[PDB]
Amino acid sequence: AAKDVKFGNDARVKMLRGVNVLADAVKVTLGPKGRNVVLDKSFGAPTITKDGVSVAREIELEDKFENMGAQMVKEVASKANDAAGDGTTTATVLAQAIITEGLKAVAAGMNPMDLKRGIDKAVTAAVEELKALSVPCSDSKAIAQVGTISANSDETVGKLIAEAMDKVGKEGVITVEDGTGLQDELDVVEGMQFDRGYLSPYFINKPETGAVELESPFILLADKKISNIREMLPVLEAVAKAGKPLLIIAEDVEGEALATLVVNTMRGIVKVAAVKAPGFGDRRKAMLQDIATLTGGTVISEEIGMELEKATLEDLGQAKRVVINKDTTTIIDGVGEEAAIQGRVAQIRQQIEEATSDYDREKLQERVAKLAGGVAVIKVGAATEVEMKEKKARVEDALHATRAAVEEGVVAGGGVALIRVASKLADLRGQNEDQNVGIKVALRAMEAPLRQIVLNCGEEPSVVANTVKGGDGNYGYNAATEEYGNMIDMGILDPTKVTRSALQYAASVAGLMITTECMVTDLP
Amino acid sequence: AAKDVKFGNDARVKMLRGVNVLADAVKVTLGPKGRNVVLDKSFGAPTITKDGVSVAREIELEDKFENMGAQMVKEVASKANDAAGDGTTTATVLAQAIITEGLKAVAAGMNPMDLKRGIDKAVTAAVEELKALSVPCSDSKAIAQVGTISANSDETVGKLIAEAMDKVGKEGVITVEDGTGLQDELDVVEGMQFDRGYLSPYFINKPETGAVELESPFILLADKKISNIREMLPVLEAVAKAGKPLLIIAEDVEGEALATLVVNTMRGIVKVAAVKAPGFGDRRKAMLQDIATLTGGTVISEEIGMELEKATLEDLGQAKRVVINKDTTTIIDGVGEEAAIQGRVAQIRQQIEEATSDYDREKLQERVAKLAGGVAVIKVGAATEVEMKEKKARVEDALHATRAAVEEGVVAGGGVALIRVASKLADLRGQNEDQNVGIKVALRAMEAPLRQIVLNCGEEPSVVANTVKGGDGNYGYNAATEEYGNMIDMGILDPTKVTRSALQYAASVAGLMITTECMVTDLP
Amino acid sequence: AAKDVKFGNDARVKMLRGVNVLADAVKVTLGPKGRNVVLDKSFGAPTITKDGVSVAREIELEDKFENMGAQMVKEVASKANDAAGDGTTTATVLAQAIITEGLKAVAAGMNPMDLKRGIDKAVTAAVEELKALSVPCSDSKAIAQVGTISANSDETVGKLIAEAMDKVGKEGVITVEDGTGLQDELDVVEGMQFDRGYLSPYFINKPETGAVELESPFILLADKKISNIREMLPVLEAVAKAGKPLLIIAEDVEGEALATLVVNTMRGIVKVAAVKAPGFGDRRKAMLQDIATLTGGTVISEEIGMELEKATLEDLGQAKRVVINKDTTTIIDGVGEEAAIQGRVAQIRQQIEEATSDYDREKLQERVAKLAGGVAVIKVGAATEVEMKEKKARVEDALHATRAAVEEGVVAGGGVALIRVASKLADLRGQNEDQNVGIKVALRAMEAPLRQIVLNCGEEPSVVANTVKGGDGNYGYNAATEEYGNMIDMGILDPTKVTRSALQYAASVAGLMITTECMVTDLP
Amino acid sequence: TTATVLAQAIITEGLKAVAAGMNPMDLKRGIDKAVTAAVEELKALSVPCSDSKAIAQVGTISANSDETVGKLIAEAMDKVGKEGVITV
Ligand SMILES: Nc1ncnc2c1ncn2[C@@H]1O[C@H](COP(=O)(O)OP(=O)(O)O)[C@@H](O)[C@H]1O
Ligand SMILES: [Mg+2]
Numbered sequence A, B, C: 001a002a003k004d005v006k007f008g009n010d011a012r013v014k015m016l017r018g019v020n021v022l023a024d025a026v027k028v029t030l031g032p033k034g035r036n037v038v039l040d041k042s043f044g045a046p047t048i049t050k051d052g053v054s055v056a057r058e059i060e061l062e063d064k065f066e067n068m069g070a071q072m073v074k075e076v077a078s079k080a081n082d083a084a085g086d087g088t089t090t091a092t093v094l095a096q097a098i099i100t101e102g103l104k105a106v107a108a109g110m111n112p113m114d115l116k117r118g119i120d121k122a123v124t125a126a127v128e129e130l131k132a133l134s135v136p137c138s139d140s141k142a143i144a145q146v147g148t149i150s151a152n153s154d155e156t157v158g159k160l161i162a163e164a165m166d167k168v169g170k171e172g173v174i175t176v177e178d179g180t181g182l183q184d185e186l187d188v189v190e191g192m193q194f195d196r197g198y199l200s201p202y203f204i205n206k207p208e209t210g211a212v213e214l215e216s217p218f219i220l221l222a223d224k225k226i227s228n229i230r231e232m233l234p235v236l237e238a239v240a241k242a243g244k245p246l247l248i249i250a251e252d253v254e255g256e257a258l259a260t261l262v263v264n265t266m267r268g269i270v271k272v273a274a275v276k277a278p279g280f281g282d283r284r285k286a287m288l289q290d291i292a293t294l295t296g297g298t299v300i301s302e303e304i305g306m307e308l309e310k311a312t313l314e315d316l317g318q319a320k321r322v323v324i325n326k327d328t329t330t331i332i333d334g335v336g337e338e339a340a341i342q343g344r345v346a347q348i349r350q351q352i353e354e355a356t357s358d359y360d361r362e363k364l365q366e367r368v369a370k371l372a373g374g375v376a377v378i379k380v381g382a383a384t385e386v387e388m389k390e391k392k393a394r395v396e397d398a399l400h401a402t403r404a405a406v407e408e409g410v411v412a413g414g415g416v417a418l419i420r421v422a423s424k425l426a427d428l429r430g431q432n433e434d435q436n437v438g439i440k441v442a443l444r445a446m447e448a449p450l451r452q453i454v455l456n457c458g459e460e461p462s463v464v465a466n467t468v469k470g471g472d473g474n475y476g477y478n479a480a481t482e483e484y485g486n487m488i489d490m491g492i493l494d495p496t497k498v499t500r501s502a503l504q505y506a507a508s509v510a511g512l513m514i515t516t517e518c519m520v521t522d523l524p
Numbered sequence D: 001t002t003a004t005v006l007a008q009a010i011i012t013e014g015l016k017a018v019a020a021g022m023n024p025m026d027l028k029r030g031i032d033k034a035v036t037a038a039v040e041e042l043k044a045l046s047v048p049c050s051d052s053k054a055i056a057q058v059g060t061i062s063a064n065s066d067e068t069v070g071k072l073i074a075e076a077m078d079k080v081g082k083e084g085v086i087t088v
Helices: A009-027 A052-058 A066-084 A088-107 A112-133 A140-150 A155-168 A233-242 A255-265 A282-295 A338-351 A358-372 A385-408 A416-424 A433-457 A461-470 A496-514 B009-027 B052-058 B066-083 B088-107 B112-133 B140-150 B155-168 B229-242 B255-265 B282-295 B338-352 B358-373 B385-408 B416-424 B433-457 B461-470 B496-514 C009-027 C052-058 C066-084 C088-107 C112-133 C140-150 C155-167 C230-242 C255-265 C282-295 C338-352 C358-372 C385-408 C416-424 C433-457 C461-470 C496-514 D002-019 D024-045 D052-062 D067-080
Strands: A003-007 A037-040 A046-049 A173-178 A185-189 A191-195 A212-215 A218-222 A246-250 A273-276 A317-324 A328-334 A375-380 A410-412 A475-478 A483-486 A493-495 A518-522 B003-007 B036-039 B047-049 B173-178 B185-189 B191-194 B212-215 B218-222 B246-250 B273-276 B317-324 B329-334 B375-380 B410-412 B475-478 B483-486 B493-495 B518-522 C003-007 C037-039 C047-049 C173-178 C185-189 C191-195 C212-215 C218-222 C246-250 C273-276 C317-324 C328-334 C375-380 C410-412 C475-478 C483-486 C493-495 C516-522
Touching: A003 A009, A009 A052, A009 A066, A009 A088, A009 A496, A009 A518, A009 B003, A009 B518, A037 A052, A037 B066, A046 B066, A052 A066, A052 A088, A066 A088, A066 A496, A088 A112, A088 A433, A088 A496, A112 A416, A112 A433, A112 A496, A140 A155, A140 A385, A140 A493, A155 A173, A155 A185, A155 A375, A155 A385, A173 A191, A173 A317, A173 A328, A173 A385, A191 A282, A191 A358, A191 A375, A218 A233, A218 A282, A218 A317, A233 A246, A255 A273, A282 A317, A282 A328, A282 A338, A282 A358, A328 A375, A338 A358, A375 A385, A385 A493, A385 A496, A410 A416, A410 A496, A416 A433, A416 A461, A416 A475, A416 A496, A433 A461, A433 A496, A461 A475, A493 A496, B003 B009, B009 B052, B009 B066, B009 B088, B009 B496, B009 B518, B009 C003, B009 C516, B036 B052, B052 B066, B052 B088, B052 C516, B066 B088, B066 B496, B088 B112, B088 B433, B088 B496, B112 B410, B112 B416, B112 B433, B112 B496, B140 B155, B140 B385, B140 B493, B155 B173, B155 B185, B155 B375, B155 B385, B173 B191, B173 B317, B173 B329, B173 B385, B191 B282, B191 B358, B191 B375, B218 B229, B218 B282, B229 B246, B229 B255, B255 B273, B282 B317, B282 B329, B282 B338, B282 B358, B329 B375, B338 B358, B375 B385, B385 B493, B385 B496, B410 B416, B410 B496, B416 B433, B416 B461, B416 B475, B416 B496, B433 B461, B433 B475, B433 B496, B461 B475, B493 B496, C003 C009, C009 C052, C009 C066, C009 C088, C009 C496, C009 C516, C037 C052, C052 C066, C052 C088, C066 C088, C066 C496, C088 C112, C088 C433, C088 C496, C112 C416, C112 C433, C112 C496, C140 C155, C140 C385, C140 C493, C155 C173, C155 C185, C155 C375, C155 C385, C173 C191, C173 C317, C173 C328, C173 C385, C191 C282, C191 C358, C191 C375, C218 C230, C218 C282, C230 C246, C230 C255, C255 C273, C282 C317, C282 C328, C282 C338, C282 C358, C328 C375, C338 C358, C375 C385, C385 C493, C385 C496, C410 C416, C410 C496, C416 C433, C416 C461, C416 C475, C416 C496, C433 C461, C433 C475, C433 C496, C461 C475, C493 C496, C496 C516, D002 D024, D052 D067
Parallel strands: A037 B518, A173 A375, A218 A246, A246 A273, B036 C516, B173 B375, B218 B246, B246 B273, C173 C375, C218 C246, C246 C273
Antiparallel strands: A003 A518, A037 A046, A185 A375, A191 A328, A212 A317, A317 A328, A410 A493, A475 A483, B003 B518, B036 B047, B185 B375, B191 B329, B212 B317, B218 B317, B317 B329, B410 B493, B475 B483, C003 C516, C037 C047, C185 C375, C191 C328, C212 C317, C218 C317, C317 C328, C410 C493, C475 C483
16 A cells, blocks of 8 residues: 655645535535535436535535545534534534635745634633523523424424423433324333444445334344354244244444355345443443333343343343434333333332442432333324425424523524624734734624525625624624524524534634644555 | 546536536427427437437436536426426526526626525516516417317317316316327326335336336235335235236335336336326325225225235226326226215315314315316327327327416417516626626526527528517417417417426526536546 | 436537438439449458348447437438338438438527427328328229339239238238249138237248248147246157147246257257237237137137146147247148138127127227238249249238228339429418428428439439429429429329338437437446 | 628528529529519619608618717708719
C-alpha cells in the first residue's frame, strides 16, 4: 500500500475543496422553500428531493483527500441528527462557514491551535445564550404545540405525542405501530427498551428507517459470547418450521456464527437478527432475567450447564413486536405472565431496600422503570395504507423533535437563534489576537443558516439578516410566509438541543480540520 | 463510486439538452399525419413506428445528467398516460415548451421559485377554462360517439362500449377477451376487480399489453406475508400436476419466495403469478373472504391455525379468467356458487343497517358493488385471427378514452383546446415581475401541440394557429382533413382528463427542473 | 443503452448510402446475362453466384443507420418474393430508383408527405395499366406455356404443372416429392394443407428450401397450449424407439417446452417438429378433427379430460410425407381409412344444409375441399440424382410463377412492362406541385429494371429503352437474344403479380423512408 | 439591406428550381423577363413627392423612424432648393 501524503496547505486546501462541494449541494435544500437536488439511481429514472439528509448520504468525491473532507463533515453532521433528530443540513452549513474563514486564517500565517481555542470559547459562550433564549417545553400545551408544528400543522399528531408522554412520562418509551383500523390507538403494554444496536446492517428489512421490524418473533436469551454456528442449529431449524422470525440476546457474536447468519438472512433460508445484551458483568445477569420474565422466556447460562443446542421453543420467549435501529433495541407486548412480571417487580422493589450505593439504588430503580414502566405504543389510523404509513413517518419525526424540545426547550427555527446569539456576544475576546480571529469566525459563521434559508427562497439574505439583527429575542423573519414577528408564535422553531448540537458538532470538526498538518491516502 | 456534481447553469443546460433530444424525436409522430421514426433492434431488421410511446421507451442518453433530463420527462409523461390513457406525446411536447422558455428566464437573472409559482397559477387557471370548454359525455349517444372515434371510425366497437356501461355502470368493470367465435358477445358474470398490482414484472406473459392473463387458474387466498418458499411446495406441486396456472393473494411476498417464484416462472417448470390482497388491516379480512366466496375457495389464516403447507386444491377458488396489469388485478367468472355469493351479499347488506359512520357504511357499499354488481365482459368476434386480435387492441384503447371522456367530458383534440384556453386568459398577472414571465411561458407553451400537429403535416403552424385563435369554443383546424369547423363534430377530440393531465404533468416536471440547483451522477 | 439519434438529412442520407450499396451489389445479377458477385465463406473458398436473393441475404453494413436502410429494403424486397415468388431483385432495383430521387426532392425543400402521396397515386395508376397490359393465364395452354418458360424451356415440367391444376384445381394443393423411379408420377392422394408455419427456424432440415421434410412421421393432435416438457416424455420416447420423425399440432408451444425441443432436435437425441393448429376458437375444434380422420389419429382435448401423458402411438395419426415451410404446413398420403375420411365428408356435406349464414356455408365448404379434394403430388423422376434434385428445384420455381400467372396473368419480363406503363401515364398530375414531382419520380424509377437488364448485358440501356418506348403493347427487347418483338412470345415474361408486388413494395418502403425524421441506434 | 433580402429569396428558390432538373439559363431568362415587367409596374405606382412633409416622412423612415431627422432634412431641401448641396 503506497501512500500519498499531503502537508499543511496542500492537505487543508484539498479538504476545503471537498467540504465545499458537499456543503454547496446540501445547503440549497435547508429552507422551508428550499431548492431541490437531483440524484441518480444506477437502473431507472433520476431522483429529486428537498431532503438534505438524503443528498448528503449519497455524496462521494473521486479525489482522495477532498473526499476525506466531505466524509469528515458527513460523519459529524450525521451524528448531530443521531443525538438531536434534525439539523444535519444546518450543521453542514455551519461547518462550511466556520471552516472556510478559519482555514483562511491559518493560511494567513496565524496560529491554528489558538484559532481552535478561540472558536471553542465562542461556541461555549454561544451555547449559554441559546439556553437563555430558549423557551421551555414541559407542559401539555408546549408538547402538543411543538408536535403539531413538526407534524406540518396536524393537531391530532401532536395531541397523541403529548398523551403518550403524559401517560408513561417524558423519559418513558413510546413506539409507533401500523394501525389496525381508522381510529388512532394509544395503549400501554408490557415491554422494554434498552441501549444496544444490531450486529449487522444486513439484518435490516426496512431500508429508509435503517431499522429491523419483526412480527411476533421468538426471543432467545443467552449468557455467553457466541463463537460458533453449531449451537444455533437445533433451535434455528425449530423456528424455521414455526415460520416466524427469531431474536437473539447474548454477550457478543463472533464472525463465524455472525457472518453465516448475515448471509443466511440475506437471500437465505431463515431471516433472523441478533443484538448484544444490556449492561455488563454482574448487572447483565439481572438485566437478562428481567427480559426473560417479561417475555416468558427461559435464560440459558453456560455457568448453569445449559447449552444452546440443548434448547427448544419452550425455552424461547415471545413478544408481538420488536424494532432494532443502529444503536437501540426495543420490544413490544411481551407474552410473559402478568403475575410473573408483577411478581418480578416486587422482588426488585424489595432489592432496592439495601440502598448500599447511590449507584446500586439508582441502577435498580432504572431496572424497575424498564420492566414495570411498560411501553407506550401508538397505532396510526388512516383511510388508506399510503396515508397510514406516511402519517406514521410524520409522527416519528414529530416525536424526535418533541423529545429534543422537552430536554432543552425550543428556539426560533428560521436560523434566527444563531443570528440573535451572534449579535449578543460582540464583546468576547481572547488572550491571543489569533484567538480573537477565531471568535469572529465562529460568530460570523452563525449567520449563514439564516442567509442560506433566505437565499433558497430567492429573497435578499443581507436585507433580512440586517432587519433580524435590529429586532430582539424570538423576533425574526419567517421565510415561508415572508413575515416578521415572533418565530415561535408563527410555528417556526427548532429544538434548543438540535441547534446546540449542530453548532457544537460543526465547531468540533472545524477545529479538528484546522489543527490537521497531514493527510494519508492510497494513490489513484 | 465517486460522484460528478453539476449545478446552476451547468446542471440545467445538460437537462435542457437531454429533454430536447427526447422531445424532438417523440413529437414528430403526434399528428394524424405524424412523421415516422426508425428504431434499430439489436437482432434482425430495424423497426419503424408512428407511435410516440414506443419511441419514448427506447430513448436513453450516453451523457449522464443530460440523460437524467430525458428520463425525468419520460417518467412524468408515462404517468400522464397511466392516469389518463393518451397524450403521452402531448405531455412531452408541452414539457419541452414550458422548460425551454422558463429555463431561459432563470438564466436571464430571474428568480426560479417565482417562475414556478407563476406557471402553476397559469396551469391552475387553464384547467377551469378547459372545464368550461369541455363538452359532457354522459348519454349513450356521447359514449358511443367517443368510443367509435377512438376506435378509428368503427361504429360497432363504439356500440358495445356504450352497451357495457349501460349494464354494469360507468364506474363498473369492463374486460375484453378473445372471441370464441365470429359473433361479438357482451355478458355479465360473477367476478371482482380490485386495485392491486403484480409483485414481479417478470410474471407478464403478454409483452405488448404489460399484463398477465391466466386461463381457468386456481386461486390461493392467504392471510400472511410470505417469506418462505417451502410453505408453497405441497400446493405448488399439486397445481403443476393439474397442468394449469395458479394465482396468489396475500399481505405480500418476500424476496426469498418471490425471487424463486420469479425464476421458477421464467424458463421454469411451473409458471404462476401473485398479487397483494385488497384493502388493509381489519378491512382486508372481510374483503379476502368476499373473493373466497366468489371463487368458492377457502381462506387461510395464521390466526386460525392453518398453514399454506396444510392446504389442498379443495381450499383453492377458481375462475375462468384473471388479468393483472401494472397496478390492477381483476377476475372473471369465478366458480363460487350463486347461493353462497348472493347470500354473502345479503350478509353485507344487513351489515350496512348499523350506519355507525359514513366511512364504514360507504366502505360496506363498495364491497357490495364489487361482489354483487358483477363484471361485464366483452368477446370480440372475427373471421380471421389477425382482425380479431387487432380489433381487441382498438376496443381497449377506445375504452380508456371513453372512461376519460365520461369522467371529465371531452375537448377538441387537434391541440385546439390548449390554443383556446391560452387565448382566453391573456390578462392573467402574477405578483413579482418574474411571476408574470412564468405565466407567459406557460400559456405560450400551450400553443406548441397544435403547431406540432400542423408541422408534422407540412402545413403552416402560425397561419393555422392564427385562424384557430380567431374562432371560438371548439372551432379549429382538422389536420387530417385540412378543414376548419367544430373539431368535436369532425371526430377529432381528446378527453378533457387527458388534456388536463398532460398539461399538469408537464408543468410539474418543468417547474421542478427550474427549481433544481444541483445534479449528481457517476463518472464516465 | 446509450442511443445515437439522427434527424432529417443526416438520418436520410445514411439510409441513402446504406440502400445504395445493397442495391448496387444486387442489381448486377438481375439480367439473364447478369453479372456475378463473390461472397466469401467463413470456412473454405469464396462463392460466386448470379442469384440476387443470396447476395441480398448476405449483406450487412458497419455503419449503423446506413445498415438500417439496407435492412429496411431487404425486409420489403423479401416480402415481395414471399407473396410473389420472384422479383426480389427487381423490387430492390425499383426501390433504389424511387428512393434516390424522392430523397433529393425532400432535400430540395419540397414536402415529404405530399411526395409520398404523389408516388402512391402513380403506383395505383401504374398497377391499373399493368392489369390492362397483362395477358391472362386461364386455359391449359397458357398454364403449360408459363410453366415451360419458367422451367428454362422444358416442356415436361410445364406439362405436369398444367395437369396438376387441371386435376385438383387452381387453388388446390400441389406438392413435389423426390422421384421413387425414373418416370414422372402425378397422383392424387388423401392429405391436407393449411396456413400455419413452424414455431422454430432451427427445425429446418433442408436449408436451401427453408422447409422441413419428414418421412412417414407419427402425428400428434392436441387441444391446448403446451408450456411443459413433461407431457411429451412418455410419447416422445415411444417415437424414439420407432426411429421415425414426430409431428405436433396444438394451440401453441411456450419457450419452456419449445426451447428444449429446439435444442433436442438440433444435435440431440430425437429430431421432431411442431406447428400451430389451423383456425381459432370453436373453428379449430372442427379443423383438428378433420386432420384426425385423415391420418387415423386421435384428438386429445383437455376439456374431455384426456392428457398428453395419457396418450400412446395408437392415438397418433400417420402420413407418408409432411413438409413445413416459413408459414405453410402440409401433409401427404395420410393413413386414415377411406371409409372414415369419405364418411367424415358425408357428415360435413350434411352440415352445409343448415345454411345459417353465408360465412358458415363457405367455411364448411372450405373444410370439404381440404379433406375431400385431396392433395395432388408430383414425383420427379430422372436417371441420376443430380439431375433429379436439380429438376425438382426447377419445378418448384415454375409452380410459383404459374400460381402468380394464374391469379393475375402475365406481362413482358424484360422490365418492358414498367417501361410500357411509365410511358402510358405521363398525363397524371397531383393537386400539390410537390405531388407532381413525386409522380415523375415514381414513373422514372419504373424505367430502371429495363436499363439494368441491358446494362448487365453490356449493351446501351438508353438506346434500347428509346426503341422500346416507341413500340406498343408487349413489344420490346429480349436481352437474351438481343432482338425486338413480342416479349411474351419470345419466352421472356414475368407474372403480372410479381411485377405489381415488386413495384408496390418498393413504393411502400420508399415513401416510408421519405416521411422518416428520426433514426435510433447503439453507439459503435 | 432590402436588396440583399431579395437576393436571398431569389437565389434559394432559383437553386431549388435548378435542383428540380431544369435548365438554369432558361430560369435566368424567366427571372429577367419578370424583373423587367416588375420595374415597369413600379413606375406607374410611384406617387410624386413634392411637399415638405412627404420629404420629411421619407427622411424619418430612412433614418430608422427618427422623426427629428425627417423634420430637419425637409427644412434644408426647401431652403437650398432643387440643386442645392446638403452635407452632414
Ligand atoms: N415602421 C415601419 N413599418 C413598416 N415598414 C417600415 C417601418 N419602418 C421602415 N419600414 C420599411 O422597411 C424598409 C427597411 O428599412 P431600412 O433599415 O432603412 O433598410 P434599407 O436600409 O432601407 O434596406 C424601409 O425602406 C421601409 O419601407
Ligand atoms: Mg435606412
